[PDB]
Write an enzyme that holds these catalytic residues in place. Structure first.
Site, PDB file in Angstrom:
ATOM      1  N   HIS B  63     -10.506  47.498  13.096  1.00 57.02           N
ATOM      2  CA  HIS B  63      -9.647  46.441  12.579  1.00 57.02           C
ATOM      3  C   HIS B  63     -10.478  45.362  11.896  1.00 57.02           C
ATOM      4  CE1 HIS B  63      -5.919  47.453  15.244  1.00 57.02           C
ATOM      5  NE2 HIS B  63      -6.401  48.500  14.592  1.00 57.02           N
ATOM      6  N   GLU B  65     -10.336  42.222  12.096  1.00 55.26           N
ATOM      7  CA  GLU B  65     -10.722  41.161  12.999  1.00 55.26           C
ATOM      8  C   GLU B  65     -12.005  41.470  13.750  1.00 55.26           C
ATOM      9  OE1 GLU B  65      -6.184  41.045  12.463  1.00 55.26           O
ATOM     10  OE2 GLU B  65      -7.650  42.598  12.727  1.00 55.26           O
ATOM     11  N   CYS B  94      -3.490  42.006  16.094  1.00 58.60           N
ATOM     12  CA  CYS B  94      -2.934  42.791  17.194  1.00 58.60           C
ATOM     13  C   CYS B  94      -3.418  42.232  18.529  1.00 58.60           C
ATOM     14  CB  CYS B  94      -3.308  44.280  17.051  1.00 58.60           C
ATOM     15  SG  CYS B  94      -4.978  44.733  17.613  1.00 58.60           S
ATOM     16  N   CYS B  97      -7.219  42.758  19.349  1.00 62.31           N
ATOM     17  CA  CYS B  97      -8.063  41.880  18.518  1.00 62.31           C
ATOM     18  C   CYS B  97      -7.929  40.424  18.918  1.00 62.31           C
ATOM     19  CB  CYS B  97      -7.771  42.046  17.037  1.00 62.31           C
ATOM     20  SG  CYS B  97      -8.402  43.584  16.362  1.00 62.31           S
TER      21      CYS B  97
HETATM   22 ZN   LIG Z   1      -6.452  44.627  15.888  1.00 63.32          ZN
END
Ligand SMILES: [Zn+2]
Ligand SMILES: [Cl-]
Ligand SMILES: [Cl-]
Ligand SMILES: [Mg+2]
Ligand SMILES: [Mg+2]
Ligand SMILES: [Zn+2]
Ligand SMILES: [Zn+2]
Ligand SMILES: [Zn+2]
Lengths: 186, 186
Positions: B63, B65, B94, B97
């Site tokens: 991801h 992040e 999310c 994260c």
């Molecule tokens: Zn995430």
């Protein structure tokens, strides 16, 4: 009733390097607290400006802020309720108006005043003292950002359906002003 | 290279009723505190996106992040100084994260994190909890308005001198999202 669009654009412009915005325009709205939520009061909204001096002379034209204080008692607010009165102002108040507003909110504990201003008026005399005194009395003073300009266009301007058009530099000027306000209020 | 304009528009569009925006883009900027004032360190800016999954399968693509957290140690920030790191993200994080970002800022007190997001990602599972935990750890989470979209266009996009052109509905979607975020964080 509603403000003329060119009047709004001229008066709420936060550009630093122009002059001639000698008037103060003030748009107001009112909310009442219910179950930890501010609820807008439909009818209690409007705008006004500073008044011209009278032909007899001697006395300055009545400032917008004093006119604003003049109207509040006519709203017949319930002293047992809590209200948030927000003013969107094109300039922040002069010292004497700040002093009057502070007096008013000290005596009217049912009113929480929020002043959201396009521009800071700092005459390098007593204007800063006024702002500090007003904040000490509980007013929440802040600088208008995009969202507040857009809100004011939508809510107070005779826009005839046309959308808010931001001007160049709007956010940069707001940010500079917010920093200047922080320095005044520290 | 700066961001391709169509890539920016596709990914940062805040209309809720389209699909296909499966990536997350994250643009970042860093300021250092110098005598009570945040000063931009313009060498420390950039953008990145989430990664595709590896061909071996099983694991999701990394991801955005997490990539962002991966690079921060390489900036060699001084642990005795104070920094403000602002991320402009196309989607909010999310849960996993948000948890990792909360752990990072809890362990790196020299960093103040601000997350300005075009859209809220709410999977109706743990996303809201993640945002609340990240805020609780000190991150300042907010929704991008016109001003932030314009800033990102001007700063991160290969615009060729073209001005930011807001898409239909930008302000109304931003206002709706700001309301939703208030309800999440309250
Ligand atoms: Zn995430
Ligand atoms: Cl002026
Ligand atoms: Cl999507
Ligand atoms: Mg300017
Ligand atoms: Mg829409
Ligand atoms: Zn008279
Ligand atoms: Zn005055
Ligand atoms: Zn792998």
């Amino acid at each position: 009733h509603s403000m003329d669009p060119p009047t709004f654009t001229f008066n709420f412009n936060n550009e630093p390097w122009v002059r001639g915005r000698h008037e103060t325009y003030l748009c107001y709205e009112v909310e009442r607290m219910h179950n930890d939520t501010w609820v807008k009061l439909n009818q209690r909204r409007g705008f006004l400006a500073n008044q011209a001096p009278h032909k007899h002379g001697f006395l300055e034209g009545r400032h917008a802020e004093l006119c604003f204080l003049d109207v509040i008692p006519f709203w017949k607010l319930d002293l047992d309720q809590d209200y948030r009165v927000t003013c969107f102002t094109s300039w922040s108040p002069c010292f004497s108006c700040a002093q009057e507003m502070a007096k008013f909110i000290s005596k009217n504990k049912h009113v929480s005043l929020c002043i959201k201003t396009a521009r800071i008026y700092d005459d390098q005399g007593r204007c800063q003292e006024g702002l500090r005194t007003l904040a000490e009395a509980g007013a929440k003073i802040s600088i208008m950002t995009y969202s507040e300009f857009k809100h004011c266009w939508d809510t107070f301007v005779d826009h005839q359906g046309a959308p808010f058009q931001p001007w160049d530099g709007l956010d940069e000027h707001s940010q500079d002003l917010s920093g200047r306000l922080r320095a005044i209020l520290q």
